[PDB]
Amino acid sequence: GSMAKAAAIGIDLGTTYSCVGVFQHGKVEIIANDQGNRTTPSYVAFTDTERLIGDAAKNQVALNPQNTVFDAKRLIGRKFGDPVVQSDMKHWPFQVINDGDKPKVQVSYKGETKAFYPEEISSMVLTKMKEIAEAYLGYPVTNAVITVPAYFNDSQRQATKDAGVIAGLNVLRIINEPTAAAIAYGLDRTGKGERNVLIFDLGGGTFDVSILTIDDGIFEVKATAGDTHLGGEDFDNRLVNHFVEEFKRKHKKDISQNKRAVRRLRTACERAKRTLSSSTQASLEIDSLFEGIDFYTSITRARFEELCSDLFRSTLEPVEKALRDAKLDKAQIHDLVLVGGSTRIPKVQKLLQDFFNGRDLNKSINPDEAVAYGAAVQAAILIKSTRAAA
Ligand SMILES: NC(=O)c1cn([C@@H]2O[C@H](CO)[C@@H](O)[C@H]2O)c2ncnc(N)c12
């Protein structure tokens, strides 16, 4: 007996990006994919000859927008008639169809028109995450913990389980994303006594605030609030609009109707935005942006902060609402935890810190990786099968 047990994995199945971890040697290792990325795009692309997942899918999205699927998490476990589904559909270049009041994404794939349920798309992203972990560990992986937003209902939770089952994974448990982040910091291991934790999660296109109470390791969701369409992509959008205007001023030319030029500008803006989190200024250099014209410029952190100022400030309204719902005062919150890559922005950090009167923020665990980190800690706990000693 007792053949060595394979490690279990923790998976953050994100709306835009996914992340996979494993707890081994008393620590969590976040596993990079073969392109060296510690997070993988939650994208699936279909061609006449291939099914591409992750980076390979995201990198060819520009010329194949109708057959490159993303945001399947926004559809999972929902009815076609759902108001959220009907509004979201207007922004996606891929076709969403009605099959018995259940949404399906329809594409061209290997010579035919094919339709997939959201949980089938998410199963393909989970298959990639499983492979990434198997490439590192050097053996097949069976068991996994998968996370969902705290506001997901039974239907959304069940459809996530089905996605794992289709991917060949045994789903140990479905756990809330905010709870997973708390586990990553060991906020459930402080012993006896009530502890109030606020999770501030600002991602690529969504913003969630969660208030939890932890008592003797037991978690309770006290409040959930947020902005459904607020994130990093809105900051990229303000920089795009600023530079479109700057090009018009300097060259008397409007670039906005050339999809390639706008796309190249946005990619450069997102990269400059990241630089501005560690540097006071950033340069933006694009060769032959429009009509053979090179675009060599810069932006200060102050100007970027001014451009996105209203958006950054608006992150505090869901913080006040969640506190109102949880029936708590700011002082009462013991721990503040930052999740999502956009929380690296100094101005965002400052606004939250000042709102909580100079309190330290838990941000030592990479914000992009904290949810998968916590999922990996819980997965290792779940597969334990100790028989009590005499
Ligand atoms: N990993 C990083 O250093 C960063 C990722 N984002 C954004 O976080 C979101 C999820 O990756 C996207 O909108 C990114 O642009 C960032 N935004 C600002 N500063 C940063 N340093 C990052």
Side-chain angles (χ1 to χ4, degrees), residues 1 4-26 28-191 193-228 230-258 260-316 318-328 330-349 351-385 387-390:
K5 191 184 303 198
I9 61 178
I11 306 176
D12 168 9
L13 182 56
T15 317
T16 315
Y17 283 84
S18 289
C19 182
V20 66
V22 65
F23 182 89
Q24 293 195 302
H25 313 291
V28 166
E29 170 80 14
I30 292 295
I31 314 165
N33 64 31
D34 67 10
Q35 285 183 39
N37 307 309
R38 296 167 65 88
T39 66
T40 296
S42 300
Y43 284 58
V44 184
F46 303 90
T47 82
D48 177 62
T49 60
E50 292 175 299
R51 183 180 77 180
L52 308 168
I53 310 164
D55 295 301
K58 192 171 170 165
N59 293 352
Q60 58 75 82
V61 75
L63 288 170
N64 191 17
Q66 295 181 327
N67 311 295
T68 308
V69 187
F70 60 91
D71 273 352
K73 189 171 171 174
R74 291 188 193 268
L75 291 174
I76 204 158
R78 289 191 193 276
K79 301 189 257 172
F80 182 86
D82 186 322
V84 172
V85 171
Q86 287 309 312
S87 175
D88 288 348
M89 268 172 69
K90 301 206 174 80
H91 294 84
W92 296 317
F94 51 82
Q95 176 121 30
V96 179
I97 65 163
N98 188 1
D99 197 312
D101 197 31
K102 293 184 159 63
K104 300 190 83 179
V105 292
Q106 188 163 270
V107 298
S108 302
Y109 176 49
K110 281 167 175 161
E112 41 169 51
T113 297
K114 263 284 300 160
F116 299 98
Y117 290 105
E119 60 268 30
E120 293 181 280
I121 300 294
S122 294
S123 85
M124 297 160 195
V125 174
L126 294 168
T127 286
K128 185 65 172 173
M129 302 322 293
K130 182 182 195 292
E131 294 175 354
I132 286 162
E134 285 171 342
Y136 172 71
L137 297 168
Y139 55 73
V141 171
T142 301
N143 303 300
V145 159
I146 304 175
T147 60
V148 297
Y151 59 83
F152 266 23
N153 61 31
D154 292 338
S155 175
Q156 294 170 295
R157 288 167 198 277
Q158 185 58 55
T160 300
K161 283 178 188 178
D162 298 345
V165 173
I166 299 160
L169 291 166
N170 176 53
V171 184
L172 299 162
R173 197 81 158 96
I174 292 289
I175 72 172
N176 293 335
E177 288 160 13
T179 294
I183 290 171
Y185 286 97
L187 299 178
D188 60 330
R189 292 194 273 106
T190 77
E194 282 221 315
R195 204 153 179 96
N196 303 310
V197 180
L198 186 146
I199 310 289
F200 187 97
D201 182 355
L202 187 68
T206 189
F207 174 55
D208 296 305
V209 178
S210 304
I211 293 174
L212 323 169
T213 298
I214 313 181
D215 190 359
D216 213 5
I218 305 312
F219 285 88
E220 183 189 335
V221 173
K222 290 280 205 72
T224 58
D227 204 305
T228 189
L230 175 66
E233 73 169 290
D234 300 294
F235 314 146
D236 297 346
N237 278 339
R238 297 283 180 86
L239 286 169
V240 172
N241 289 351
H242 163 82
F243 287 118
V244 164
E245 187 188 301
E246 189 191 284
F247 195 95
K248 277 183 74 184
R249 189 181 304 272
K250 179 168 187 181
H251 309 282
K252 282 68 181 170
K253 280 161 195 293
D254 191 351
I255 72 156
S256 69
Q257 298 316 293
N258 187 288
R260 186 164 167 264
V262 172
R263 173 169 75 250
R264 287 177 79 214
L265 180 58
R266 188 180 323 273
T267 293
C269 288
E270 189 278 332
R271 280 163 205 182
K273 176 189 71 181
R274 292 199 184 203
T275 297
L276 292 165
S277 293
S278 48
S279 281
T280 48
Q281 66 287 322
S283 54
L284 192 128
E285 313 174 331
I286 298 158
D287 291 327
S288 176
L289 173 62
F290 190 72
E291 291 189 27
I293 303 158
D294 292 344
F295 195 52
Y296 280 53
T297 191
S298 63
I299 187 147
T300 64
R301 184 183 287 177
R303 183 65 176 130
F304 166 68
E305 284 168 346
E306 188 182 57
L307 284 166
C308 301
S309 62
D310 55 299
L311 301 173
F312 295 163
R313 288 283 280 260
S314 74
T315 63
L316 304 175
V319 177
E320 298 179 313
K321 191 194 180 47
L323 286 167
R324 202 173 304 133
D325 289 346
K327 281 172 171 71
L328 299 174
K330 325 172 171 181
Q332 292 184 279
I333 297 301
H334 300 78
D335 306 295
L336 298 163
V337 175
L338 302 180
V339 177
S342 303
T343 65
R344 282 190 166 88
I345 302 160
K347 189 59 180 181
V348 171
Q349 284 187 18
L351 295 160
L352 188 59
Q353 193 163 68
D354 297 337
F355 177 83
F356 282 100
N357 307 124
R359 197 87 71 79
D360 178 54
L361 310 177
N362 291 291
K363 63 179 182 78
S364 60
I365 290 192
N366 194 314
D368 289 320
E369 313 171 351
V371 171
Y373 190 120
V377 168
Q378 208 56 37
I381 293 169
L382 289 175
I383 67 171
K384 285 172 175 172
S385 74
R387 271 133 177 248

